[model samples]
Target chain A: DNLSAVLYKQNDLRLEQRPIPEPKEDEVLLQMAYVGICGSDVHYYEHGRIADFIVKDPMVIGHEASGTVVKVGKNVKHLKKGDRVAVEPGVPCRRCQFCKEGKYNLCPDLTFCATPPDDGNLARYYVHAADFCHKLPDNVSLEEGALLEPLSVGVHACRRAGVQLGTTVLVIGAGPIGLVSVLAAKAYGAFVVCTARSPRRLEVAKNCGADVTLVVDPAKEEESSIIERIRSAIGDLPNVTIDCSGNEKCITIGINITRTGGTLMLVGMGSQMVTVPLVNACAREIDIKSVFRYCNDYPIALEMVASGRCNVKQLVTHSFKLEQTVDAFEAARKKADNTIKVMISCRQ
Target chain B: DNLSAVLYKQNDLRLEQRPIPEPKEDEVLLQMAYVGICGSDVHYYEHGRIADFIVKDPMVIGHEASGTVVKVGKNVKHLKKGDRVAVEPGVPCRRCQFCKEGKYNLCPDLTFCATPPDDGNLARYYVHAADFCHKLPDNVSLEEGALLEPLSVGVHACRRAGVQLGTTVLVIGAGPIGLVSVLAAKAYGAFVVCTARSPRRLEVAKNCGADVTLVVDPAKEEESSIIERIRSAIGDLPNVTIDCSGNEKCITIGINITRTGGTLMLVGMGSQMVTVPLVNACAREIDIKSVFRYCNDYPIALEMVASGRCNVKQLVTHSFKLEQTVDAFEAARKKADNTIKVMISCRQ
Candidate 1:
């Protein structure tokens, strides 16, 4: 029997047995080894929706995953049985202009795992497109492979924000995404400055290669005061700010703290409406570039992790078995014990 | 003798006789020909300020100007007497990082004409850095040269927005900047759709090569209704939107109207703090790039106009003599007679 963790509706999660999925012409059947619980997964569990994506039917949860190939389709050549790999979730239609233009993340017909109307790889046995499964290097572990998904997000954010050698970057949150952003920016040869509300998170950011870390009171502190403190701490303002906090106050502070002609990368999802200093941004010519998951970034993330340039393994703070998937999601949702990344093992 | 239209204070514009200034070693003295009355000039005349740039002292107005070179300094080589030219107003210090990075518009040491304490070239004679002035082709008239400054704004907006050949573009606002944006987008082989509140402005936009023109009722019409009408008019949504109207409502509509992964360029100046659909932009990954005047765009604008690819002459709907400076300001400030660009002749 194939054991799977599925979400039927809001606050309704269940473990059930289903038929093992079969590999198609260009697909691979994998026995999932590891799956990391994402904030979006928890959001779906609690609210049953994210933006326009609603859970009207039972959907297997988890996209940040890794597995060992159990079977290969007739046309597959790169990997065979027993090959460990990391799964890149979103697969776009190759016929679209976005795919041909190398920006498949923006494809209208992209089928992203666990988003909505798409089954993910949270089951003991699952099938995925062959090209989307990347074989892991010998030095990388399955756990590291699972973490590559979020690491790709950080890499994409830094790349789109124009982070380069000797560039200064300010990361607004020290959670998983923010910590990985620090690691990615540092690997890009940038001086990374990070801010978070929790001192523990800030320390995690420092451990992840942030040169400077500041704790902020988002609710009590004024935008001007925060800008001053950040400027004083960093000595000079950042040329690029990645907002992983998704707080309106933090976004505003990030806008004001960035240098003129700089960029602000929106990496976190916040409220439906946010108030920003548009006039200030216009006068300074500061651009805002937002990220939608990541495209063509998984390979880079795996390489970075394998080379020890990005230490994503340290971000995992809690782990549970596939049978304890609910406990794993609870640990992630509560964010307790300074939790950063929570991983669930799908192996028996 | 130099006759200058100087703003001593708010509503105190005076035509005064001043000593003709001499050129520095790298400068050229020009006998002013045509200076266009801009919204910023009128803002200074009405409120003595624009944002943080306060006209605390007597300031000569008008930066969108063209002239005939009367004298060249010893170190000037590219220019000589009797050459008609268009003057780029902002002179940035070459020592700054912004200048070295090729984004001189963000230089903190930039001394822009008619901004704050810096006097401008609204006089019968003026001196400018020789390299900042571009010699006009014989076929391009001085009036067209004066209009190049505004045209540069449009080109910069389009270039930043990534409007390419066959790209669909929605231009919000049919003012001078909007009309020029239409011309520039069309010159770049884009399909232009323009929207404005007034029918006359939309007609001018059509004359400027807009493929479709839609008149909007900003206060009464719902954003969803406007979006439906524009989609119905253009058939397909624009891949890029240039918001020349800084109204918050228009900006929100533009963000929603732009296609996924497209761009929204902020070219119009609105309130210091305006509300925008930031979440929608973030979710759709719609990047927002704002223009701060133009940088290295004058040459491109001149080439476009000189090649007849861009026609800027029709934008000058009104003209006045130097002695009629006050009337020109009134016409521009009031936007009377559907005035788009008002030209002031400084020649005797």
Candidate 2:
């Protein structure tokens, strides 16, 4: 039987036919219904590389997947055929110290999907460990399931930032992840504020429950004014600042606007090296924390969606069929208006 | 009617007569038995200023003091006459958030003794809040009591670094604070290794229960050898690295040799700013925690000393009479031979 799939072929994506694979022991074969196109996936598709991961050959590119289980291995006890689930893409060796310490995201032996040589779940029939597949509640749709990947990223950032009741938080970017962070912060009872250059994105951020949004001219010469603007908008300095802009300007602002003895969580990869005011941090004794990627966050994201604490559906602005994989890439590349999350649907 | 004390008189040391202070409400008048000269006190004596606090007029210069209470105020409930006590030099406004949070050391409105404009304890009698004066145990000598101030700094650094059982700790200096940190880390069940430039100080560090000591040559062409030496000696990368040397080389080595996702505590203020490999920390998601002066450390330090878990008395190597104040300062400044601590006794 032929299964419809999305494959990255020589810097271009193509709809192709592939054979359906059977589920092994402790595995579940999923009929993927929806897959979100993450920024990393788009980067790999456009430049065929991200960081150290290079696309030397054609590879399956989607990892943010949600689907109905079509087959279950004999030893898979938690999952059954016909269950809707969100697939966690990274599988780490449980024997490492990092994994044993509950920090599986830092495990060096992690096999992450869509990262260079690792095969991803873009195919119609994909087998993954049943334990990593989160069963989505009936209230959450498959579209929300696909958005769980980025939501989990926000959850991890918030967790590291320690966003709790009465906390004052500052988010640097108004992108999808940043918006989700605003929502998560609100859910955790924190007063949220965000900054971005795009007025439209800032508006979306406000809709996502940001208490304050600051719009700035991207070409402004004086950067200190931006810091002042954020400080003035928030009344007092933020107790916790998360940089999601992946830019030096936002990183510096985040550092300057955080209160003394506060925490700065770096969620974006900006410059490899940036001269920071280490003396300021030392004098005030502020702590700096960073995150690699989401770890053990799928269940929390699913619960948030199922409980209606967050509206992940609001982020999906564009959708395309599996046969229109090339068109989906074009739509996501254009950065058009209101294009927050662009997804590819495989189920007919 | 007259109290003669050492005073800073326009760059010259002079003996001055002043009125003995009387105890206020909730205060006590102490007859200081011993006082240890700190590096900051020496700086004030030589330069008439340390940091932003300027000696506009003649001032007494001593903060690390141990004494016997001679009088108590009407509201003094914790301390009584004849009680042996160690004086905590700083008194903060009790209404501030920092004070309320039990971190009075960081209070901006703190009136610290010997820090310019504030009279220190270098006199026959001084008055302080009874609550800030900790009653020393019967077994802890006045000389050991004088060393508790610096020991409190080590306690704060270790607490900020979260050193615990099985924690491998790297201390970057072998000065009094570093030596005390080694002792405190060991008391807290951590295996400690220390580095210093002076072989004598390294020997002192070893004598104080440091598992390993490394002597670093400032003229070395490269620091990689020293880093490798530390790694090999410690058997594994330290889970927490503390910078007490306040030197650029030590800070760089501490950052480079710490384990991924580990904690780096900056305790020394050698330079205003130093270049650091922040990208490496960010990539590995390490946490950099900076410590200010200690808060709520007196009780813990007292407990440790009382329980015989820490041998703070080992830090005191020299004692002097009140008439030998200059000699005590001179000995502490020169660190001649094996002089770890030099205490000047006010008793006849």
TM-score of chain A of 2: 0.95
TM-score of every candidate relative to the true structure: 0.98, 0.87
CAPRI-wise, candidate 1 is high
What does each candidate score in C-alpha RMSD?
A: 1.3, 3.9
**Candidate 2 Cα misplacement greater than 4 A, ranges:** A1-19, A37-59, A216-228, A246-252, A317-342, A346-348, B1-17, B37-60, B116-118, B216-226, B246-252, B316-348
True contacts kept of each: 0.85, 0.51
TM-score of chain B of each: 0.98, 0.95
lDDT of 1 by residue, B88-122 (tens): 99999988888998999889999998998999999
Candidate 1 overall lDDT versus native: 0.90
Which digits, one per residue and each the tens of the lDDT, describe model 2 over residues B1-348?
324455565346565667889899989998888888767777777777776678887777788888999999998988889999998888999988878987787777888988878888877788999998999888887767777888888888889888999899999888787888898898889999988878898898888889989887646736788888888897779989988866666666777788877888877766554655665676677787878767888778877888887888777788877666777777877766487777777765
- Stretch of 10 with least lDDT, candidate 2 chain B: B1-10
